[PDB]
Each structure stands twice: as C-alpha cells, then as structure tokens.
C-alpha cells in the first residue's frame, strides 16, 4: 500500500519560521489525482485543519490560518512540505499529514503525529546532578539512588540506567513547572543495599532539543 | 462561519445504546458530507464512518450514522459499546475548502490497592554545590491514594519557597508515585544543622532527615 | 432554504409539487452558488414555481399544468 | 463556553408565515429564560417577546416563540410580516451568571426602477488654494443601478493618482448617491486649462467640466 | 417613568482608559431592586454582553472580556460609569446602558446608544472648504452647492445645512480612506439656482474627536 511518514525537527521559536515535510512512501504524489492537506491537534483539544494542496499549484487555507501558510510540493523528491510563519505560543498542536482519497469527503490513511511545538527562548541544556543515597535514604533491606535534572527547556528528556540495562524499579516523574520558566524532574532506582559499594550505577539523561547526552556516575555520599 | 457543535463529554455504559450528535451553525448538515474519525489518545485517528451512511471495511456494524436535516444535526448511533471504542470521535464536514473538524467525543466506563508511603531522600551533591546551586529531593512513591501533602522543614520552622512537588503517576505497581523538589542557595543548605521531610499520606506521617556531611 | 428538500424521503412544498424523488434514487445532486448573473437587481422575477397541485405525482415526470403558479423573491443584497 | 446559534439571514415575503430559530450549544435551551429583541438600524434595541411564552404590552399578538428542549433550540414564529418588521433579531440567555446573546437574524426581503445619473461639479474654492491644497468633488446622485465608473480628465489627458470614489449609498428618495475626489497640488489646478469628470451609467455618459476661473 | 442617558468622551485611545457614564432621570439607582448593565454593538455585529452591575458591589464581568472591566455606582449622583482598560482597535462597538428588572431575564428599557471610535492613537481636525457653484455645476432649473470635509481623523462628523433648518435635498455621503491615513467626506443640497444669490447657505461641520467646529459660508463663484 502506501504510508506517509513526517520529519523535520520538533521544535521552533516564537515569531520563527516551521518546517515540517511529510514523505511518502509506496506510492506517487502525481499520479491518481488525489489530494495532501496538513492537520493539526492540540493536546486535549480538537482536529483543526491548517490547509490542502493538489500536485499543482492549486492551494487553500483556513482564514483562520490565512496568510500564514505556504506548503510546496515536489514530485522529483516525492514529498511535500509546509512552511508557518510567526508562529506563537498558541501553535503547540501535534500535526498530522493525510492523503485525501475525496477532497470534500475523509481521508483514508493518517500518519503519525509528531509533537511539533513552539519553543521558548528559555532552551538551555539541563544540569544532571547524582543523588547519592546514605544509611538515611535507606528503609530496611533496599535502598534508593538516582539522579536530578534540573534547569533544562524544553520537554522531553529521555532517562536511561546503564543504557537500558536496569529497568526494574525505574521510576520516571513528569516535569514540573519552576519558579522561573525552567522545569525539573528525576528518575530513580530502588536496589538492595547489598550491592551499593559493589555495583556500578550510571544514570544516562538524553535531551534531543539541547543535545546533550550527560552520563552521571552515582556513588554512595562520602562524609567530608 | 460555519462551525459544527458537538457534545464535551458523553458517557454510557457497556452493552447500551448512545446517540452523538453533531449540530451545524449556518449551513444546513445535509449540504455537504459529514465524516466520523476514531482516534485513539497517542494514535492517529482513523476514519469510522463516511458518507453519512458508509462503513469502512473492517470496522463493526455497529458505527451507524444518521442526518437529520431539519434540526441541523448530524447523529451517530452506537450500539454495544465496550472497552476499545474508548476513543475520541470528530464529526468532520471540509463543506467546501476547508475542513471543519467537531469538538469531539469521550468515552468513560469504568484495582488499585491501598499502600505505604515510601519516602526517600537525599542530600544536594558536591558537584551542584560546586555550580552554586543546592537542591533537596524528596521522593514519595509505592503508595495508594494519589493525595499526598509535602511540607518541607528546615530543622523546626517549615519551608515554602523554592518548594516544587510533583503530582501523583500510574506506576506498573498499581500504585503511586510523586516527587518534590526544594531549591536552595549553598549557604541556605548550610546555615540550618539538618534539613528534613514530612509526608503526610491517610493520616499517618512518614519522615526522614538529611543533614550536611 | 430548498437546497435540504432534493433527498429522498421527506415531505415539502417544492419536493412533491415538481420533482419528487423516488425511493430508488441513485442519483448525483450538485448546486452552488452564481448570485452575481441570474438575480438582476431590484427583483428578478423570471423564474416561476408551483405552490398548489391537486394531489401527488409519479417521480420523474414534469408537471406543466397552468390551470399555483407564483413568483420568486430573488434579490442580490440578500444573505 | 455556551452559545447561541442564530441563523444570519432569514427572509419572507409579508403576509406569510416565518420561523427564526435560536440552538444552544452546551446548556439546554429549556434551563434558562429566552428572551428576543428587535433592534431597528440606527436605534436602540427594543424586548419583542419574553419567559418563552409572554408578549409585552404594546407589540402586536404575531410574535410567538416557542422551546423544543430536544432540539436544544428557541423558535420564534413570525405570522403576517409587515414593513416595520424588518429589524435585526438577537436571543438572549443567562448560562451561569453570563449573559449570552445570539448571532442575529434581520429581515431581508419585503421593483427597483432606474434613474438618470446627475453629476455636479465644483472647482477648488480660494481658501483651499490659500492652504496650499486642491480638491475636485465629482458627485453622483439620484440614480440607479448603483454601479457607476469614475473616470477624471486633466484638459484631454485622464487621471489616476490621488483619485478617490465613494461606494454608491441608497438614498432617501429609493435612489442611490455616489461620490469622487482628485486631490491635486495647486500647481497642477492651474497647470491643465480645464478639469473634466466623466461617469459612466448603464452605457450613457455624463460629462461636466470646470475651469481655474 | 425612567430614562437612561450616557455621556463620556466617544473617541478613546489604544491602550489606554475608556471612560463612559450612563445617568438616571426618573428614577432612584438604590430603591427597587434591580440591576444595571453595559451592552455594546459592533456596527454590522451582534450584542455583546460587558457585565452587569448591582447598587451594592456585587460585579459580574464576561470572561472574554475579563480583568479589563471597571464598573462603579455612586447613589449620590444618581449614575453609573464603567471604565475599560487596553482597548484595541477591535472595541469599536455601540454602547448601551439599560434597565435590567430581572437579572436572568431582559432589560425593559435600553438607552440610546453612544458611538466609540478607536483607530490609530491619533486625532487631526478637519479642513473644511467651500464647494462654489457656478453655471456649469446646475443642469437645469435647480443647482448644487456644498462643503468639503478633507483630511480628518477619526470617524466620524455630522453636518448641518443651516443649523438643521434644511434637509431636503441634504446628501450626507460615506467617508473613504484617502492615499495617506485620513479620510475624507462631503455634505451637498440640491437647490433651485433663483435662490442662489438671495439666501445664504452654511455649513455646520462638527466633529467631537478633534473637538474641532467649522461653519463655512456657501457663496457662487467670482471670477479672478
């Protein structure tokens, strides 16, 4: 059959420029005489339609959405893609590409959303710093350790043990808002203590929008 | 201005009947062809029903749609309704150049075990102290029900600033977990001897104390 | 405000006095909108209708009986 | 996040018999008072009808509503239009301690014969050229259809710049009115031997002149 | 009975403080036990609810246009004024203050309603000249005779033939946005030409935003 699959990066600042491309794969944007469109949808809010566009030239908008909106289509390549301009801290929607079998009907297939959102100039990369567990962090015969991440924009961040190695007893909490813009959060792992002074244990923190692979190293507390 | 008005919440129980209605503002309903999309939460929606009588093939009988055109209103009738129809459905009418999506549809139907509140803490590292900065973590986790009270205390006297606590999540346990945060200056960490914190969770109080070592 | 009567399976003025629609009805409705040639301004009254008809009629067959007949109200200034 | 959806444009012919619908969105129209007023253009709203059900005292019998609760609509029903029923029609509700209006309905439709296009014109009077400025007024009046071209002359050569018309206007005697301006320096006034303003109407032309005299 | 009056400056600048009182004349504001209430009308628009008032504190505001309503009742004074804060250029809406007997149900008596203009932060005052008629401005037994309103901002004026003594034959055009910012209007009367050099013809420009009042005298041409 055919499938469309989006790219381009997930983020982009206020009054910017947004680049998304949906790629199609298992079939030819000319032939057939159907039609492409980009669809939209915050979350927790309903489907909004941005616009829709032939393998010509022929265009549409929502007014809503008018004057805003370019998207081109290139045959030789095989995709299509869509520019928004001045985009807000209203545009944080997951946006959806479809193939449009009937124009004023449905759309027959619809492809992963990608979480195409406005990031603010608070981006930063976060500070990863160990929790290193002691004889009070401990109740009874296991024990906790992990690590922090704090003062990084913008959601997500992937949290990793021993590079997937340890899942059991991983627990990763949702990011809350800081006094100032930032957020913060930890994952955490509970162990024997046993094994405290003879295992190694490595928390593997990802943030794919500030590129930043830290790899933290967490120890018993040593008193000084 | 044509926008198309359709119910915020919607409930019934399984193996009922239940009717959803889309109503339209300016243009009649029976003008342009009214589709029905079933997504489901972190999925791509997929188109239900079409045509204002047209099945799919491969979704159940059961996904009947009807136009009334003199109220203006596009009906979806279902029938049976179990677990996975827990979806969102959009009435969608494009009318002519641009897609009018529905405000859509819920479904609500409905063993979490009652536990201990867990607590764990530890100290700021050397290395954020290095970096001017002091964080104390207090974690609350494996425990039932999801309404916890953080209050961190700095020796006797309570502690409010700076203070961020997480809510309670779905875990693989059955049950809950949170998080909370204090953010400190180094010599705020320093000034007090100890620095504890209180989890009050079904009456009973857990609490444990850090100190700088 | 007629362009809901063309369906089958209802009951009107315009639907049942010059074209009903059949049960069997696979037919392909298209209409749009051209105000800006067919309503000269001030009144066009060129087109007529049929309001009262002694009884139904078979589907597809043209009822041009002059034995009802009234006038439009069509206007380019209207919404 | 209630609202009321009123239709934007109904029209009937006087003497029959119309129907003029208010659907909420969210709330049920049955939960709280309805009430419709008729506002002339260019004057103040005025109550028509009242709880559904209740006339004031004063307006004719044949402003009847009515409520269908399962529709979620208000239905106001309109016997025998007259002339002085065409005036825009607002529902009002209350929600929850928020008033809510409706979208509007007015009265459209309740023939036209032509007239002949007067144009009047006017040159620069000499207390404009004291303030170093020159305006021409072309002005068209009394005529019909309202589409008119404008056209200036500078001796035999048209112009262009700093030419403004006006929208053709209904005026009070059933005819139409019409209006155009050429803003020119007092340089160019005297510069042309003669000002021209040609309007064409319906393939006959009209054409006035003027001179710096 | 009771009548409800406004008063206030209509023209009002962008992001600053409308100002707009509404008195009693009949009535008693605290006696009775009813409420009062501001709805404004967009020209072309539907009603739009602002809030409604008691004589005691009681306020309840729309939430679209909430946290920018002020509303207060002096009983000594026997009016109510409402004062609206960072108002755009959207705002441009006729104001009414009326009567509510029944707060859930309608208002029995509506005032007449005031005209706001809110454009651009800016006010010039007109320029009004004279519109001389002469032998080549009358085609047959009647002539034409006028003033021009030229480059003034903002919306609107009224104009007068002899202090309102003449209307018939009184043409009062629609103004239209000039090459640069201001707009521009005139005001004429249709006229038999044997009057022309018996009676005197003046103009009664009035135009509250630049608080500007012209009267020009219509006179035929002379030729220099």
């Known amino acids: 059959q055919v499938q469309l699959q989006e790219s381009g990066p997930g983020l982009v600042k206020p009054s910017e420029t947004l680049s998304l491309t949906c790629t199609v794969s298992?079939?030819?944007?000319?032939?057939?005489?159907?039609?492409w469109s980009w669809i939209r949808q915050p979350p927790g809010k309903g489907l909004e339609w941005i616009g829709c566009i032939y393998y010509s030239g022929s265009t549409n908008y929502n007014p809503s959405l008018k004057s805003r909106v370019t998207i081109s289509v290139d045959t030789s390549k095989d995709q299509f893609s869509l520019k928004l301009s001045s985009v807000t801290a209203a545009d944080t929607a997951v946006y959806y590409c479809?193939?449009?079998?009937?124009?004023?009907?449905?759309?027959?297939?619809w492809g992963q959303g990608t979480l195409v959102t406005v990031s603010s100039a608070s981006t930063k990369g976060p500070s990863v710093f160990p929790l290193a567990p002691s004889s009070k962090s401990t109740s009874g015969g296991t024990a906790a350790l992990g690590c922090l991440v704090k003062d990084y924009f913008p959601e997500p961040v992937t949290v990793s043990w021993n590079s997937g190695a340890l899942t059991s007893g991983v627990h990763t909490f949702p990011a809350v808002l800081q006094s100032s813009g930032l957020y913060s959060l930890s994952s955490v792992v509970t162990v024997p203590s046993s094994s405290l002074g003879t295992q190694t244990y490595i928390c593997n923190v990802n943030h794919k929008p500030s590129n930043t692979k830290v790899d933290k190293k967490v120890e018993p507390k040593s008193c000084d | 201005n044509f926008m198309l008005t359709q119910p915020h919440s919607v409930s019934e129980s399984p193996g009922k009947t239940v009717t959803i209605s889309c109503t339209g503002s300016?243009?009649?309903?029976?003008?342009?062809?009214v589709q029905w999309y079933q997504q489901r939460p972190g999925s791509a929606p997929t188109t239900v029903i079409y045509e204002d009588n047209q099945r799919p093939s491969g979704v159940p009988d059961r996904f009947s749609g009807s136009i009334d055109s003199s109220s203006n209103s596009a009906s979806l009738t279902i029938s049976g309704l179990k677990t996975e129809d827990e979806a969102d459905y959009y009435c969608?009418?494009?009318?002519?150049?641009?897609?009018?999506f529905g405000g859509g549809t819920k479904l609500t139907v409905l063993g979490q075990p009652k536990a201990a509140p867990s607590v764990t803490l530890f100290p700021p590292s050397s290395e954020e102290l290095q970096a001017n900065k002091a964080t104390l973590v207090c974690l609350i986790s494996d425990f039932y029900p999801g309404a916890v009270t953080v209050a961190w205390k700095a020796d006797s006297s309570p502690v409010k600033a700076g203070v961020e606590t997480t809510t309670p999540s779905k875990q693989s346990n059955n049950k809950y977990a949170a998080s909370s945060y204090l953010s400190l200056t180094p010599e705020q960490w320093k000034s007090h001897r100890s620095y504890s914190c209180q989890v009050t969770h079904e009456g009973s109080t857990v609490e444990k104390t850090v100190a700088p070592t | 405000d007629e362009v809901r009567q063309i369906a089958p399976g209802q009951t009107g003025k315009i639907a049942d006095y010059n074209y009903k629609l059949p049960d069997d009805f696979t037919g392909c409705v298209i209409a749009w909108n051209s105000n800006n040639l067919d309503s000269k301004v001030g009144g066009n009254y060129n087109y007529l209708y049929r309001l009262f008809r002694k009884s139904n009629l078979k589907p597809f067959e043209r009822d041009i009986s002059t034995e009802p007949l009234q006038s439009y109200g069509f206007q380019p200034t209207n919404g | 996040n209630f609202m009321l959806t009123q239709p934007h444009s109904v029209s009937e012919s006087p003497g029959k018999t119309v129907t003029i619908s208010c659907?909420?969105?969210?709330?049920?129209?049955?939960?709280?008072?309805?009430?419709?007023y008729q506002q002339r253009p260019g004057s103040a709203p005025t109550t028509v009808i009242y709880e559904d059900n209740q006339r004031p005292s004063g307006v004719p019998d044949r402003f009847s509503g009515s409520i269908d609760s399962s529709s979620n609509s208000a239905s106001l029903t309109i016997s025998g239009l007259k002339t002085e029923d065409e005036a825009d029609?607002?529902?009002?509700?209350?929600?929850?301690?928020?008033?809510?209006?409706?979208?509007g309905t007015k009265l459209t439709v309740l023939g036209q014969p032509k007239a002949a296009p007067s144009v009047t014109l006017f040159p620069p009077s000499s207390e404009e050229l004291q303030a170093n400025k020159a305006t021409l007024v072309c002005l068209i009046s009394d005529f019909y259809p309202g589409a008119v071209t404008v056209a200036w002359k500078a001796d035999s050569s048209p112009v262009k710049a700093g030419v403004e018309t006006t929208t053709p206007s209904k005026q009070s005697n059933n005819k139409y009115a019409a209006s155009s301006y050429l803003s020119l320096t007092p340089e160019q006034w005297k510069s042309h031997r003669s000002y021209s303003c040609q309007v064409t109407h319906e393939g006959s032309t009209v054409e006035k002149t003027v001179a710096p005299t | 009975q009771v009548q409800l009056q406004e008063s206030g400056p209509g023209l009002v600048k962008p992001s600053e403080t409308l100002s707009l009182t509404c008195?009693?004349?009949?009535?008693?504001?605290?006696?009775?036990?009813?409420?009062?209430?501001?709805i404004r009308q967009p020209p072309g628009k539907g009603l739009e609810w602002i809030g409604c008032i008691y004589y005691s504190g009681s306020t309840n505001y729309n939430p679209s246009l909430k946290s920018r309503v002020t509303i207060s009742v002096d009983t000594s004074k026997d009016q109510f004024s409402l004062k609206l804060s960072s108002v755009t250029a959207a705002d441009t809406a006729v104001?009414?203050?009326?009567?509510?007997?029944?707060?859930?149900?309608?208002?029995?008596?509506?005032?007449?309603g005031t005209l706001v203009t809110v454009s651009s932060a800016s006010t010039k005052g007109p320029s009004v000249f004279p519109l001389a008629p002469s032998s080549k401005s009358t085609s047959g037994g009647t002539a034409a005779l006028g003033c021009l309103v030229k480059d003034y901002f903002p919306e609107p004026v009224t104009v007068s033939w002899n202090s309102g003594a003449l209307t018939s034959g009184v043409h009062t055009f629609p103004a239209v946005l000039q090459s640069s910012g201001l707009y521009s209007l005139s005001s004429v009367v249709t006229v038999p030409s044997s009057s022309l050099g018996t009676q005197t013809y003046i103009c009664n420009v009035n135009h509250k935003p630049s608080n500007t009042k012209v009267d020009k005298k219509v006179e035929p041409k002379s030729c220099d």
């Open positions: 298992g079939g030819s944007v000319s032939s057939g005489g159907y039609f």
């Open positions: 969608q009418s494009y009318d002519s150049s641009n897609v009018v």
């Open positions: 300016s243009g009649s309903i029976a003008s342009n062809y």
């Open positions: 479809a193939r449009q079998l009937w124009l004023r009907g449905r759309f027959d297939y």
